[PDB]
Amino acid sequence: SEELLDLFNRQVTQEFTASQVYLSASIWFDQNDWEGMAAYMLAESAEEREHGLGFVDFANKRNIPIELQAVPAPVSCAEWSSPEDVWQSILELEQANTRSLLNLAEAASTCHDFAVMAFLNPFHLQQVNEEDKIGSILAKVTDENRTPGLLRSLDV
Amino acid sequence: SEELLDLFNRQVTQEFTASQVYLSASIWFDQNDWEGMAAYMLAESAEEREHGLGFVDFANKRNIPIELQAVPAPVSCAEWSSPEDVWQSILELEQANTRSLLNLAEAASTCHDFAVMAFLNPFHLQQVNEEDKIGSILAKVTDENRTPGLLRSLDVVS
Amino acid sequence: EELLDLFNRQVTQEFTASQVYLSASIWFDQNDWEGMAAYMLAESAEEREHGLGFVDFANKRNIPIELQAVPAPVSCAEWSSPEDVWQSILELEQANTRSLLNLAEAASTCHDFAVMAFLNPFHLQQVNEEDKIGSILAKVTDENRTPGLLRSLDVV
Amino acid sequence: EELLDLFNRQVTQEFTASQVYLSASIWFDQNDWEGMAAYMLAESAEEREHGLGFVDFANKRNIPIELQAVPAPVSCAEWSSPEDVWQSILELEQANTRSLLNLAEAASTCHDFAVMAFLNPFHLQQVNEEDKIGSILAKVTDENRTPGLLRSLDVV
Amino acid sequence: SEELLDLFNRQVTQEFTASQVYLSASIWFDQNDWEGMAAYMLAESAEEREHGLGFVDFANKRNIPIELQAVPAPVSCAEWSSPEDVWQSILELEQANTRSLLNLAEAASTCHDFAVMAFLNPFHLQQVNEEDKIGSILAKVTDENRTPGLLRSLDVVS
Amino acid sequence: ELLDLFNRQVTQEFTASQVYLSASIWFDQNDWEGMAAYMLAESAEEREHGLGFVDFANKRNIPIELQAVPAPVSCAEWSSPEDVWQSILELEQANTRSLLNLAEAASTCHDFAVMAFLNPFHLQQVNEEDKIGSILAKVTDENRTPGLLRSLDVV
Ligand SMILES: [Fe+3]
Ligand SMILES: [Fe+3]
Ligand SMILES: [Fe+3]
Ligand SMILES: [Fe+3]
Ligand SMILES: [Fe+3]
Numbered sequence: 001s002e003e004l005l006d007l008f009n010r011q012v013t014q015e016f017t018a019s020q021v022y023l024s025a026s027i028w029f030d031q032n033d034w035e036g037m038a039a040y041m042l043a044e045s046a047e048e049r050e051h052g053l054g055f056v057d058f059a060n061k062r063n064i065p066i067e068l069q070a071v072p073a074p075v076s077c078a079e080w081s082s083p084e085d086v087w088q089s090i091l092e093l094e095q096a097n098t099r100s101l102l103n104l105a106e107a108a109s110t111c112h113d114f115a116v117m118a119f120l121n122p123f124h125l126q127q128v129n130e131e132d133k134i135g136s137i138l139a140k141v142t143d144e145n146r147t148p149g150l151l152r153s154l155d156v
Numbered sequence: 157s158e159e160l161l162d163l164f165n166r167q168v169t170q171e172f173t174a175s176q177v178y179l180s181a182s183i184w185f186d187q188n189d190w191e192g193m194a195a196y197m198l199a200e201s202a203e204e205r206e207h208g209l210g211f212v213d214f215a216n217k218r219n220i221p222i223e224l225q226a227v228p229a230p231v232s233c234a235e236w237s238s239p240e241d242v243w244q245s246i247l248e249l250e251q252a253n254t255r256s257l258l259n260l261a262e263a264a265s266t267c268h269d270f271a272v273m274a275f276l277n278p279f280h281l282q283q284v285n286e287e288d289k290i291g292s293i294l295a296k297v298t299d300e301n302r303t304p305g306l307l308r309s310l311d312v313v314s
Numbered sequence: 315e316e317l318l319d320l321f322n323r324q325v326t327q328e329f330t331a332s333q334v335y336l337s338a339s340i341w342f343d344q345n346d347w348e349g350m351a352a353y354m355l356a357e358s359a360e361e362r363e364h365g366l367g368f369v370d371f372a373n374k375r376n377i378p379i380e381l382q383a384v385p386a387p388v389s390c391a392e393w394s395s396p397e398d399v400w401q402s403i404l405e406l407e408q409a410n411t412r413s414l415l416n417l418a419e420a421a422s423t424c425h426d427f428a429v430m431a432f433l434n435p436f437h438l439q440q441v442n443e444e445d446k447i448g449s450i451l452a453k454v455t456d457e458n459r460t461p462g463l464l465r466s467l468d469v470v
Numbered sequence: 471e472e473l474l475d476l477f478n479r480q481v482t483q484e485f486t487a488s489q490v491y492l493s494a495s496i497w498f499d500q501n502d503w504e505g506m507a508a509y510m511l512a513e514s515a516e517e518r519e520h521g522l523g524f525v526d527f528a529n530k531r532n533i534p535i536e537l538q539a540v541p542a543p544v545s546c547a548e549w550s551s552p553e554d555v556w557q558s559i560l561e562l563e564q565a566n567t568r569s570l571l572n573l574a575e576a577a578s579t580c581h582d583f584a585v586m587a588f589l590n591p592f593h594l595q596q597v598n599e600e601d602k603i604g605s606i607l608a609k610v611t612d613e614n615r616t617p618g619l620l621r622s623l624d625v626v
Numbered sequence: 627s628e629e630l631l632d633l634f635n636r637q638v639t640q641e642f643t644a645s646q647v648y649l650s651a652s653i654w655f656d657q658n659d660w661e662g663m664a665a666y667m668l669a670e671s672a673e674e675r676e677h678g679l680g681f682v683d684f685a686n687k688r689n690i691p692i693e694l695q696a697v698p699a700p701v702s703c704a705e706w707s708s709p710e711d712v713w714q715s716i717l718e719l720e721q722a723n724t725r726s727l728l729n730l731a732e733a734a735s736t737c738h739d740f741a742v743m744a745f746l747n748p749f750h751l752q753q754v755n756e757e758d759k760i761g762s763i764l765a766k767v768t769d770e771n772r773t774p775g776l777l778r779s780l781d782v783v784s
Numbered sequence: 785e786l787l788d789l790f791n792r793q794v795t796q797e798f799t800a801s802q803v804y805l806s807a808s809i810w811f812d813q814n815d816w817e818g819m820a821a822y823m824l825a826e827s828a829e830e831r832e833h834g835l836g837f838v839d840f841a842n843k844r845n846i847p848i849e850l851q852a853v854p855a856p857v858s859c860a861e862w863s864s865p866e867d868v869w870q871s872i873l874e875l876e877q878a879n880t881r882s883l884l885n886l887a888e889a890a891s892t893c894h895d896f897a898v899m900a901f902l903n904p905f906h907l908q909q910v911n912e913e914d915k916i917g918s919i920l921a922k923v924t925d926e927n928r929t930p931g932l933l934r935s936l937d938v939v
């Protein structure tokens with residue numbers, strides 16, 4: 001179950017990585033005068049970090065040794081040119097978050113780690129909601145952005 | 157101009173670095189059953205991150221380009237043996253945080269960037285308070301750790 | 315001295331800005347942009363309040379104030395769409411930031427610590443103000459690309 | 471059009487009176503009459519609200535407004551006691567009354583019944599204003615016959 | 627640097643000194659039956675002392691060694707013979723209080739001590755208000771004392 | 785002289801106020817924030833007593849000449865909280881002696897109003913000496929085990 005301790009560490013790292021990527025997206029939104037979209041990303045940034053803290057807290061309680069990895073620089077921001085690009089990368093991030101949680105659940109299942117499985121249950125359910133929501137926002141952005149100016153309306 | 161813009165950008169990295177080292181301390185304290193000290197380190201971790209977000213927000217408004225950098229793996233944790241070690245690393249962290257702010261203020265000064273200097277003032281004053289507070293806690297920790305079990309007795313209280 | 319002269323000029327620049335905001339509110343009102351008009355009117359009162367704050371401080375610090383003419387606004391003659399108005403307003407705020415920086419430079423030269431402390435919150439407020447007008451202008455320029463679309467968001 | 475011209479001259483007069491009242495507050499403040507300074511300051515704000523009321527009316531009624539320069543108040547350079555200040559203020563109010571009566575006369579000639587209705591409460595207000603200033607000026611010139619006594623009454 | 631540290635110490639002494647000078651002014655007013663003026667001075671004395679305490683507390687946080695000096699006796703009371711003399715000495719005390727702070731800021735500036743500069747900003751602004759308020763009371767006093775007994779109205783009011 | 789001693793009681797109160805302030809400074813610089821807050825509160829209170837004496841002297845036409853308030857000097861030689869508390873006990877004993885000498889001079893002059901004014905200060909000095917005495921005893925007891933006194937500064 002090195003594989004398990006490992007994946008559990010990778011999950012913590014994925015949560016903080018995703019928090020930074022959300023922060024990068026709020027920065028791009030802000031810089032380009034989409035304050036509504038920026039507020040939304042900033043709030044998701046804080047939430048991803050809360051998920052990381054929740055995994056750490058659980059690992060401490062269960063004596064899963066956690067060691068903090070570097071949180072890499074978000075990369076996609078240098079390539080974003082419009083809100084559509086940003087929301088697409090955020091959907092890909094969320095798909096990565098889902099995979100990372102499934103990888104861990106798979107390893108827990110193999111080890112018969114029932115406590116880890118019970119712990120992950122609300123995060124599986126949260127990811128379903130998260131993916132659906134981002135996917136749904138991206139569809140609106142992509143439909144609205146077909147008329148010059150109209151997406152500025154969505155920005156609330 | 158280059159210097160100021162780079163340093164401002166780097167100040168955000170230093171805020172998030174400090175956030176992660178606070179978090180690593182919390183995990184050490186937790187793993188070693190110092191839950192009072194862990195909760196304190198945890199709250200400081202949130203607070204450092206809020207400072208880095210205030211620098212980001214100001215940079216956005218002032219058109220200072222921000223490029224978010226890697227937040228490095230905290231390293232002091234592999235070598236911590238006792239609460240005193242962790243608090244001493246936290247003191248060094250705050251002293252570093254103060255130095256990075258004074259450097260930034262030094263560049264803002266050279267550049268005559270009055271806005272950045274105004275923005276920095278409450279951070280300077282906050283750093284004075286933070287160093288004092290951590291210095292004080294370390295002195296308390298080092299004094300109580302002289303009698304076996306006594307320091308534990310304070311984690312439980314305050 | 316040079317510091318007295320500039321302190322006076324800042325007063326004049328605040329009252330000039332207050333009138334330029336009023337001129338913008340009139341153009342928007344006459345062209346049926348009531349929400350943009352209400353916004354300019356609000357800014358006009360607030361520039362005047364800054365003017366009064368400088369005067370109050372100068373009287374306390376024995377800096378003599380000579381009230382200058384507030385010149386007739388002249389951009390309204392060229393405005394023909396909301397984008398032209400907002401562009402003139404961003405240039406007004408850039409000039410406000412400049413008048414304030416010149417005053418700060420002279421206070422710094424004379425080592426006038428109390429003047430510098432007084433200007434700090436105005437420094438920070440000018441950051442917010444430039445950002446905010448820049449952002450509305452970017453939004454206006456984007457929405458204006460579809461006929462009627464700007465109008466529908468003046469109703470907001 | 472006499473009417474349009476005069477309606478514009480009325481706005482300028484309101485904003486001019488606002489600036490003159492401000493000049494008077496400065497003189498009072500500089501000379502440590504904080505009670506009188508606060509009174510002149512409140513009156514400065516009210517005069518500007520009147521000018522805003524005429525501008526708003528003018529916009530609704532399609533009276534084109536071009537905002538003219540607000541001249542530097544210059545009386546301040548020769549004021550040397552509160553009596554001089556209050557006397558200039560009375561003179562300012564008598565000029566406010568004349569411009570309003572001039573405007574009403576042109577409205578009347580043009581049979582402009584909407585303008586006439588709009589002017590009624592300003593005619594009544596000017597009545598109250600001249601009475602009030604004339605009455606303060608009588609108190610000030612009576613109390614100033616005893617050294618220090620006027621001061622004792624700036625404790626408003 | 628020694629000079630900043632020394633001026634910081636002298637700033638504390640200047641605040642306590644002004645506190646005692648205000649107290650001397652309330653005593654003279656009270657002895658001569660100007661209880662309104664006496665209450666004003668007494669409020670100002672507690673306030674100056676609060677300033678000295680704020681300076682002490684900042685110095686402690688920032689490890690600026692403080693050594694309390696003697697608070698010298700007020701000297702001007704022996705020569706006051708009317709409220710005008712008192713308010714005039716009080717305006718002079720506040721002019722010195724402002725010079726004293728300006729000197730300290732100049733030394734902080736030379737040293738690039740941005741934390742000290744940030745800490746002094748509200749004291750620079752408070753001195754502006756204090757010198758204007760005292761200057762205006764002095765003007766009112768010297769005007770009203772032109773008519774025998776009239777000044778005795780200022781008092782039995784403010 | 786009653787008048788001379790009355791004037792000197794003012795100086796003693798403000799002297800005590802400053803020594804208490806010197807003691808908060810030492811505790812604060814040495815990270816005893818609990819003891820520092822207590823000293824600071826006692827500093828304010830000693831100054832209030834001095835103000836009460838001045839106010840009574842003004843009412844009773846006792847001329848008040850404010851004297852120099854001397855520099856506290858025990859701070860030079862404090863190296864533990866026990867030293868600081870020992871100096872404060874001596875300060876309060878001094879405060880008590882100067883009130884008794886003032887009372888003695890009032891008694892000799894049959895100054896009944898001064899004696900009546902002093903009564904609550906005599907009772908307050910009894911409480912003060914007891915409380916400081918009692919703190920010094922707790923401090924000297926707890927300081928026999930390394931770090932233990934620190935643990936109770938948090939109180
Ligand atoms: Fe997550
Ligand atoms: Fe920080
Ligand atoms: Fe402004
Ligand atoms: Fe009017
Ligand atoms: Fe002060």
Ligand SMILES: [Fe+3]
Nearest residue numbers: 797830833879
């Ligand atoms: Fe006492």
